[PDB]
């Protein structure tokens, strides 16, 4: 009744491989803002993938970079969830 040594990990990355990760001037990282905002609203009632999927959408939609350098102007980001989980994860009940 063996378990794989790599099982039951989940990696929630702020951005996909090869890509930049953004922060809005003054405040902090886009992925963090979103994560905190969804966890505050739903961390105790949604499954971890629902939460992170909502985080994916929030980062994808709500945010877009501004900059006086055209090379960095109006860019976008998408986070990336890697799941090796074997069950659903709720933080409660």
């Amino acid at each position: 009744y063996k378990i794989p040594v790599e099982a039951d990990f989940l990696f929630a990355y702020s951005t996909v491989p090869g890509y930049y990760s953004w922060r809005s001037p003054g405040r902090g990282e886009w992925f963090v803002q979103a994560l905190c905002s969804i966890l505050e609203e739903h961390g105790k009632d949604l499954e971890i993938m629902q939460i992170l999927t909502r985080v994916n959408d929030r980062v994808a939609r709500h945010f877009e970079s501004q900059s006086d350098d055209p090379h960095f102007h109006e860019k976008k980001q998408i986070p990336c969830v890697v799941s090796m989980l074997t069950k659903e994860l709720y933080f409660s009940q």
Partner: protein
């Protein structure tokens, strides 16, 4: 039957690594805003039920050591484990204050064969770092 068992004495430990300042020889700048992020994350995760600990400006040896040690504690009465990394990064690696260490080497300490008291329990890593140079220009 289809969810992870949460009936444990505790939700578990949440380690936060908040790397803001870097040795000049790394070529990396200060990460402004990261204190605000670490604070907000510490509150969310405390609110969920985690025992949260926040480390700040860790060297590479420090990050490896504290995760190794965490992996060697007894998690029998914890439901899960979480680690949140806030730092500079490049593909597959994350910065300490004094250089770069492979993300996979940090997480490997928690593998099944090496951290038996987290067997069959979720090991969560939230990773906030650059992962290369590319910019998504967007569309529509």
């Amino acid at each position: 039957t289809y969810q992870y068992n949460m009936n444990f004495e505790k939700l578990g430990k949440c380690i936060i690594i908040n790397n803001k300042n870097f040795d000049k020889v790394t070529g990396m700048g200060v990460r402004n805003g990261t204190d605000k992020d670490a604070e907000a994350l510490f509150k969310c995760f405390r609110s969920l039920g985690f025992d949260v600990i926040v480390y700040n400006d860790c060297s590479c040896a420090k990050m490896q050591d504290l995760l190794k040690k965490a992996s060697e504690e007894d998690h029998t009465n914890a439901a899960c484990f979480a680690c949140i990394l806030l730092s500079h990064g490049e593909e597959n690696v994350i910065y300490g204050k004094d250089g770069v260490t492979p993300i996979k080497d940090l997480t490997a300490h928690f593998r099944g064969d090496r951290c038996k008291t987290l067997l069959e329990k979720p090991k969560l890593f939230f990773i906030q770092a650059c992962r290369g140079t590319e910019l998504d220009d967007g569309i529509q």
